[PDB]
Amino acid sequence: YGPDQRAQKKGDIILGGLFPIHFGVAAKDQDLKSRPESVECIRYNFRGFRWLQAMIFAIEEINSSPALLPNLTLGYRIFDTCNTVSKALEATLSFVAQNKIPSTIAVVGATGSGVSTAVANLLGLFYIPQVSYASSSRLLSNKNQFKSFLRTIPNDEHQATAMADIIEYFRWNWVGTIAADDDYGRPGIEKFREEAEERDICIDFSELISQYSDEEEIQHVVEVIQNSTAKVIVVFSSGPDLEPLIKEIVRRNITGKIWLASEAWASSSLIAMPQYFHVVGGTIGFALKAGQIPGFREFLKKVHPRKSVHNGFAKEFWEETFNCHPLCTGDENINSVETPYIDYTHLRISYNVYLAVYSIAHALQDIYTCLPGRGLFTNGSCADIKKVEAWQVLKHLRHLQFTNNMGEQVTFDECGDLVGNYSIINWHLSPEDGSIVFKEVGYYNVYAKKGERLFINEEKILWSGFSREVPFSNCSRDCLAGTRKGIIEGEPTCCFECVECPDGEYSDETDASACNKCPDDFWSNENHTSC
Amino acid sequence: PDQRAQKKGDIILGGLFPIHFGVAAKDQDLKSRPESVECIRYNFRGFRWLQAMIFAIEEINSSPALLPNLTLGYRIFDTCNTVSKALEATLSFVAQNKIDSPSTIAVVGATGSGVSTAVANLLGLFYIPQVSYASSSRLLSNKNQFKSFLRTIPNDEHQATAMADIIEYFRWNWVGTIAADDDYGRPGIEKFREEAEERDICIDFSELISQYSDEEEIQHVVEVIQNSTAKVIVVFSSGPDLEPLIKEIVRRNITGKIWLASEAWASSSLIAMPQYFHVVGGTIGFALKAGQIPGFREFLKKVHPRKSVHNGFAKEFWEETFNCHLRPLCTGDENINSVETPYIDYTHLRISYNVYLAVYSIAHALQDIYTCLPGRGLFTNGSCADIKKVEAWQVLKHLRHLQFTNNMGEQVTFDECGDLVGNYSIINWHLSPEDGSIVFKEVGYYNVYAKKGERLFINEEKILWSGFSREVPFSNCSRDCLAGTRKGIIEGEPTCCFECVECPDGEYSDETDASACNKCPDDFWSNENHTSCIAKE
Ligand SMILES: N[C@@H](Cc1c[nH]c2ccccc12)C(=O)O
Ligand SMILES: N[C@@H](Cc1c[nH]c2ccccc12)C(=O)O
Ligand SMILES: *[C@@H]1O[C@H](CO)[C@@H](O)[C@H](O)[C@H]1NC(C)=O
Ligand SMILES: *[C@@H]1O[C@H](CO)[C@@H](O)[C@H](O)[C@H]1NC(C)=O
Ligand SMILES: *[C@@H]1O[C@H](CO)[C@@H](O)[C@H](O)[C@H]1NC(C)=O
Ligand SMILES: *[C@@H]1O[C@H](CO)[C@@H](O)[C@H](O)[C@H]1NC(C)=O
Ligand SMILES: *[C@@H]1O[C@H](CO)[C@@H](O)[C@H](O)[C@H]1NC(C)=O
Ligand SMILES: [Ca+2]
Ligand SMILES: [Ca+2]
Ligand SMILES: [Ca+2]
Ligand SMILES: [Ca+2]
Ligand SMILES: [Ca+2]
Ligand SMILES: [Ca+2]
Ligand SMILES: [Ca+2]
Ligand SMILES: [Ca+2]
């Protein structure tokens, strides 16, 4: 059978699903004293449950549309990954059960690049297409490695360049970098490192973090941050991988810092806590272009613990949202409790889930509506939808082109990626609410020419959550007239000494490389300003 | 899989080896149902490592000292240096366990860190211990991720520091970096990057490569190398991942470069080719601690396709050695000594020794299973493991707490991260005068047990730079500032890149590579060359 907690529904064609319904697994690192029992998943993820719902909603919406996959039913087998490779693989082994009892023709998921890579290695083997709604690592664009992998989220390459463009914009040359020690944080900071050095930005420190980092490991990173004159900190990490570090920085009230948030934690409920505002206030981050899902918000509200014969996560959702089953009536209202399930402004990753399901639906439709000699298969033959195999769906998904329910053109490139713009958000505090509000202060247009991609409105930004002045984050303060830039041995190029000009020489303008000799008739003034 | 090395036993040890260097590099049309991909370049060294697992298993079996009561059986598969082929095989090892959604109690392998990580994710799930003889990535030290992973090869962390120590030694400040775009090359160069920056070494370029890189992808890297003033190139890659790049550099006869070889390619048959010597000559690389396995070289010669019934790779080995079929045909009367392949053409057993050591680690862990009596145990209430009903997780707790004495009388133990420390030998790529083949001369050593700064030993006299010159090459961004001049900033370029600005009148510079010029005392004035001061002004 496979895992106990699941969202299952029978159909003619089955779509697998992988969602982080829980943030992690139990802190039980067994001594292996006895036979190891299955680990239990711990922190409930309401946002993750909302994404699971977007898959079901889309599946039901397709099932109701008679012209899309006519006289056919889309079924599903959705599992909880708990943001862990092991739990995800347990589930993936169930999807591939038949391949070496209904077949899984395609899989939606996973979230974390580390989890999606592990799933892709196993699915790729059986040519089952995988459509991830959130895994953005550049490593997943390698089609020699990931033969059946596609995604409805852009690759992080431009996001890391956008970081370096923002730094170049506000004219900062002294930054620090923090990355989650996974297939997401590591390639993201590496691309950023490359782009910052192109734009002559010096990186003072480059540290690694994880959700399972020691008190010792966290201490070292906090010390590195404190012992650094760099105020700009670039962070390529997820919420769970960053939470241990942020908790400690909040505890020590380290307030100077101006955080540059990667898309994974820029909208994380684990970091966007009002208690952390003294530390995380005025964070500049990335958000994906938001999409529209009409009727979805209504569908979310219809969730009932008893009703969901199909959704086995509906009981646990009810229990966590109402500190329930104390006991539940079942007649409880979901508008009353404030959880990220309904407490959202824009559907971004949820939209990517919706878009992922529709990509598979449209790929299956192209097989179905195929005309004798216009097929993608041998001699121009068409596949039989009644006898459809996963590899056939993959062939179609590879260079799929379809029109969005918003009327927009959706296409996957040669690396199975979607290209998308980014919205730039700033972490403000709502005066009335008291909660962290994500104000859209700019955008990053990836279609624009290099140097014309970034748009920022400085006026909408609240530095450190309060300040209205762009902070200083250069290694050394600029050399004034009468002085020249001097090298500091062991320190990088944008760390300089301001050496006073020698007698007979002058420094007319600010940040001079050397002083100019006065013409033979004249001599330097009292402080070498000019002669 | 069809092609395997199987033998029944009481306890089965899984095996993963790169019998082939890669798979048919082709985009599946997907016009037709995808068939099993074809593995392509035969790996004789890989086959010799597979043999070290069988030899060790047979040596344990014959010997009464170890498990006289039990027979060690095996199920060995070819990975073809690919995640997919390795996972196909791993799915077979876990076949019995998988039913919850013939037991394999432990697995030997794989080689590539990318392959071992994929295998580890699947094995770790079922707590089947995995002992890799060659996967050296630091990423595999993470015990939250890799619960059942252990290795008989050290972690690359000190190897990358050793690179930076060698560069610091020869006083070079301008280098380039090349890494295989995998879980091996990437963390190795990243650690090197940290260490080089701590020793004030500037990296001009940082490029990525792969065995499946485009003609365009390779061309970009060769252009980057050519357009760079850096002569020292640090390469963290395997032979297969580096071969496409080296082939092109040889084709363009780019000879200036001085290569710093990662342990994976420092002894690679694919790179250590005599037609590449103009390019790869005088390469400074790393080799692990060697080992001798008595009777192994005679065991290697005993291979026949009809006789070796258990080894299904013998047929293909035979065919690729004598260039025959089982285009001319093979005779069961062919002699092994006649054909010269890397199977017998080896000098030291290093990775082969790690395979031998990996099998013995599992053997000694199982041996500690019988010797157990209630009280001497680690389980339940001091409980022990029933060697007749042994489960893989039981072998794993024993392997974690494993301490045993080696074939060379050395203590073998695993870290809390399943690692084992080891020193490195530093080799140099020389040419045999008579033979014309690439000889690996041991020019130094790296002692990991020594204090920081005292770990490296090198004999410059034994090194032949570029394969010929005895002069340590220049590889700094800018030539040193002589007396009379001071160091000046270059706005775009890093700190290693400086201008040598002439001292002003009334000032001088006593020393080479000065930050600023010193003012002469009032009685004196600047020298003709600004190197000192002369009296009367
Ligand atoms: N992009 C991240 C994961 C991620 C992106 N956005 C998110 C929002 C919430 C949770 C996780 C994410 C990765 O591929 O690893
Ligand atoms: N250490 C490399 C593989 C490797 C080391 N030595 C080798 C010799 C031959 C072939 C491969 C190797 C890795 O972890 O990926
Ligand atoms: C439509 O579906 C029903 C139920 O699955 C089936 O009985 C009928 O034969 C199908 N029609 C076609 C055209 O296949
Ligand atoms: C910081 O450095 C950049 C580049 O050197 C420069 O343009 C900027 O003006 C400096 N910052 C200040 C404080 O002026
Ligand atoms: C944190 O520091 C800031 C500035 O020093 C200050 O405004 C704030 O009140 C401090 N927080 C606490 C815990 O008082
Ligand atoms: C990206 O933004 C630009 C301008 O803001 C727009 O022209 C483009 O349509 C947007 N992205 C997409 C999905 O095309
Ligand atoms: C090169 O490298 C360092 C500077 O970082 C220095 O010790 C050495 O003397 C330099 N000079 C030359 C010409 O090698
Ligand atoms: Ca329908
Ligand atoms: Ca997930
Ligand atoms: Ca620069
Ligand atoms: Ca979150
Ligand atoms: Ca330095
Ligand atoms: Ca025996
Ligand atoms: Ca291998
Ligand atoms: Ca090799």
Residue numbers in the entry:
A (entry chain A): 20 to 119, 135 to 359, 393 to 598
B (entry chain B): 22 to 122, 136 to 360, 392 to 602
Study authors write:
The extracellular calcium-sensing receptor (CaSR) is responsible for the maintenance of a stable blood Ca2+ level. CaSR is a class C G-protein-coupled receptor (GPCR). Ligand binding to CaSR takes place within a large extracellular Venus Flytrap (VFT) module that consists of two domains (LB1 and LB2). In addition, CaSR contains a cysteine-rich (CR) domain that connects the VFT module to the transmembrane region.
In the form II crystal structure, both protomers of CaSR ECD have the closed conformation associated with agonist binding (closed-closed). Surprisingly, the ligand-binding cleft of each protomer is solely occupied by an L-Trp molecule. Ca2+ is bound at four novel sites in the CaSR ECD structure, including one at the homodimer interface. Each CaSR ECD molecule also contains two PO43- ions. L-Trp facilitates extracellular domain closure of CaSR by contacting both LB1 and LB2 domains of the VFT module. The interactions between CaSR ECD and L-Trp are primarily mediated by hydrogen bonds. Third, the CR domains of the two subunits interact to form a large homodimer interface that is unique to the active state. Finally, the structural reorganization of CR domains reduces the distance between the C-termini of the two subunits from 83 Å to 23 Å. Site 4 is part of the homodimer interface formed upon agonist binding, bridging the LB2 domain of one subunit and CR domain of the second subunit. Our structural data indicate that the Ca2+ ion at site 4 stabilizes the active conformation of the receptor by facilitating homodimer interactions between the membrane-proximal LB2 and CR domains.
